[PDB]
């Protein structure tokens, strides 16, 4: 649906060649977050799916080569980003900001 | 990360009594501390085991 | 009647019909979860009820 992000989601395919996915069929279910966040979740899911599949039904040196190719371009392809929203605190409209102080 | 005197004193006492048991590996020293000592907190045990290995280095 | 007009107003909506359980106050009422214990009174008995001061 966010068409500008499509080539970002497709970039796991082109990082190693579409032939690494030619004999593979995927079925992804996305049920959280916003819309741009789901784009990064699918990127992780596609990249990990190739890595996990080549570990289980292919030898290791292919998997290590594939994961090495993923890592040398972008690390977050295979590891999740741990950043999460901070809790709101009283006295301010956000995590860190605070209401204006008047003296006179 | 300056360690408190509680960790350092406990690290020293265990070394004096149980020097032969301890080794230069942090992971083996973890379980021996749970054995040769009684602590209710996991984080304290690692801090003691972390200093013990550094001390015996 | 000496008392046929006493307390004749209909208090059914609720600002003078709801009160604190123990304090009997009409301001700062905590009606959530059916507590009905108004402010300055729920804080005293919070630890007795079970609401522990967590985050």
């Amino acid at each position: 649906n966010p068409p500008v992000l499509r080539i970002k989601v497709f970039e796991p395919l082109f990082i190693v060649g579409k032939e690494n996915y030619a004999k593979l069929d995927l079925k992804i279910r996305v049920t959280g977050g916003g819309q741009v966040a789901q784009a990064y979740a699918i990127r992780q899911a596609i990249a990990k799916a190739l890595i996990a599949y080549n570990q289980k039904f292919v030898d290791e040196t292919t998997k290590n080569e594939l994961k090495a190719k993923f890592l040398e371009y972008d690390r977050t392809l295979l590891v999740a980003d741990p950043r999460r929203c901070e809790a709101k605190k009283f006295g301010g409209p956000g995590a860190r900001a605070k209401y204006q102080k008047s003296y006179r | 990360g300056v360690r408190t005197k509680t960790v350092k004193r406990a690290a020293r006492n265990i070394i004096e009594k149980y020097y032969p048991l301890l080794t230069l590996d942090f992971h083996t020293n973890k379980r021996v501390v749970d054995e040769v000592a009684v602590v209710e907190t996991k984080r304290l045990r690692n801090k003691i085991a972390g200093f013990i290995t550094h001390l015996m280095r | 009647g000496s008392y046929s007009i006493y307390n004749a107003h209909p208090r059914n909506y609720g600002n003078g019909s709801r009160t604190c359980r123990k304090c009997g106050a009409r301001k700062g009422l905590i009606r959530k979860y059916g507590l009905d214990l108004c402010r300055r009174c729920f804080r005293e008995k919070a630890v007795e009820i079970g609401f522990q001061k967590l985050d």
Partner: protein, 91 residues
Amino acid sequence: MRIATKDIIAIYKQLFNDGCIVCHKDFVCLHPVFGIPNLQVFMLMKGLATKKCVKETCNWRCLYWTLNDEGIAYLRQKLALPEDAVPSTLK
């Protein structure tokens, strides 16, 4: 104060038969037992408290009363129970 004398017996005979009857401090509502204003039952009992006949402990806007030895004697004098009416600990 001015309450129906038929009702006055209802509080007295119920209080004796249980030793204790409570009421709310909300004078805008009626009692759910006797079906009469809480003001009437409240002031029929505080007057009896000055006889040293009960105790007027108040808790959470609910008042509690407990029959005493003088309460048992005074109740017999008014409602005219037989002299064997000294049950105690039951009614």
